Design a protein around this ligand. Structure first.
Ligand code: CAC
Length: 355
């Protein structure tokens, strides 16, 4: 069975911010080690990686947990007043089911109940919008760091005239792998069934050189995918194998220092993935804001109707007052509670393509 509209935007928004977190961890799992003879460009490119890692940590340590928690708590924290409000309206109707007219006290109370509930929705709208603005601002900083890393690698790669053909091959495989991993994550974000509570993050370094992480001239690109009880470590290995198997063979033909230069775009695999995840999050956070805006305007419509002389009878038939809406809301709250307490596992490994 499928997610109802409020469930869908709740879950999608939350999973998308969880992908940002996963890819920030992937940035932190990106690394490279100088060759035995450290070249002119190493320190400056390393600083650019450090800058990307710094921005990643701001999300992991501060902004991320706050944005991600705001999505379910907006639903959870609205529940008590929403229920009491709808119950009060039902009770008003039961006591005076023919009440109509702006001077009728039942109408007046119903109007005041829905006006106050709408004012609460407007506050929630602003809260979500503010969160999406904080994400936006942070994402500008991450984009800057990403662009600087990309451009740094690109300029270095231009200066070694012999390797241009191998760099092209590596960067084709890198683009292929990025796209494949991105699809795994986007598929989850946009899934239309309940993900459950077994949500996890798979974070890998990917050897792009013969030299393993920590040894001279090594390059380790980062990848991450979110899944739930569908991503697996075996799936990630088969993709790495699919995309990089041939590059791993080619890299063995090259000197250690050369393999490193060929792999330098890998240092921004993780940050390109974070940039994509920022894109997706901004979109589904707008969808989530829209969930609240729609609801707010529905309540406003009830207020307008009452003030123009509508009967309570006409109001009790509206969508917001209906049994279906109550049951969808109740299901959205439950979904949101499960997300808010979900304990998201992080598993970290170092992977290499096949030989
Ligand atoms: C009451 As609602 C935010 O699920 O439309």
């Amino acid at each position: 069975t499928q997610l109802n509209p409020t469930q869908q935007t709740t879950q999608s928004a939350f999973l998308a911010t969880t992908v940002i977190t996963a890819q920030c961890h992937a940035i932190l799992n990106t690394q490279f080690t100088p060759p035995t003879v450290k070249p002119d460009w190493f320190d400056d490119l390393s600083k650019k990686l450090d800058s990307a890692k710094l921005v990643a940590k701001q999300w992991i340590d501060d902004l991320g947990p706050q944005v991600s928690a705001s999505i379910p708590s907006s639903v959870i924290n609205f529940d008590a007043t929403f229920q009491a409000s709808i119950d009060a309206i039902h009770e008003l109707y039961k006591a005076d089911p023919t009440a109509s007219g702006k001077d009728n006290t039942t109408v007046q109370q119903a109007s005041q109940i829905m006006t106050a509930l709408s004012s609460q929705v407007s506050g929630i709208e602003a809260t979500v919008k503010g969160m999406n603005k904080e994400l936006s601002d942070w994402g500008v900083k991450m984009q800057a760091a990403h662009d600087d890393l990309v451009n740094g690698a690109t300029n270095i790669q231009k200066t070694i005239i012999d390797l241009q053909t191998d760099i092209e091959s590596m960067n084709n495989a890198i683009d292929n792998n990025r796209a494949a991993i991105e699809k795994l994550n986007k598929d989850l974000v946009y899934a239309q069934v309940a993900v459950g509570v077994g949500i996890f993050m798979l974070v890998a370094g990917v050897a792009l050189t013969v030299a393993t992480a920590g040894t001279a001239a090594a390059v380790s690109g980062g990848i991450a995918a979110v899944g739930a009880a569908g991503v697996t470590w075996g799936v990630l290995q088969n993709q790495i194998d699919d995309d990089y198997d041939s590059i791993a063979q080619e890299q063995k033909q090259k000197a250690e220092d050369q393999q490193q230069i060929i792999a330098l775009q890998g240092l921004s695999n993780a940050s390109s993935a974070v940039v994509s995840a920022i894109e997706t999050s901004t979109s589904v956070l707008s969808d989530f804001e829209t969930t609240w805006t729609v609801f707010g305007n529905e309540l406003d419509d009830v207020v307008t109707k009452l003030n123009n002389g509508a009967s309570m009878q006409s109001i009790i038939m509206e969508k917001v007052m209906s049994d279906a809406a109550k049951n969808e809301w109740d299901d959205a709250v439950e979904l949101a509670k499960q997300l808010a307490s979900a304990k998201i596992a992080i598993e970290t490994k170092e992977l290499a393509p096949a030989v």
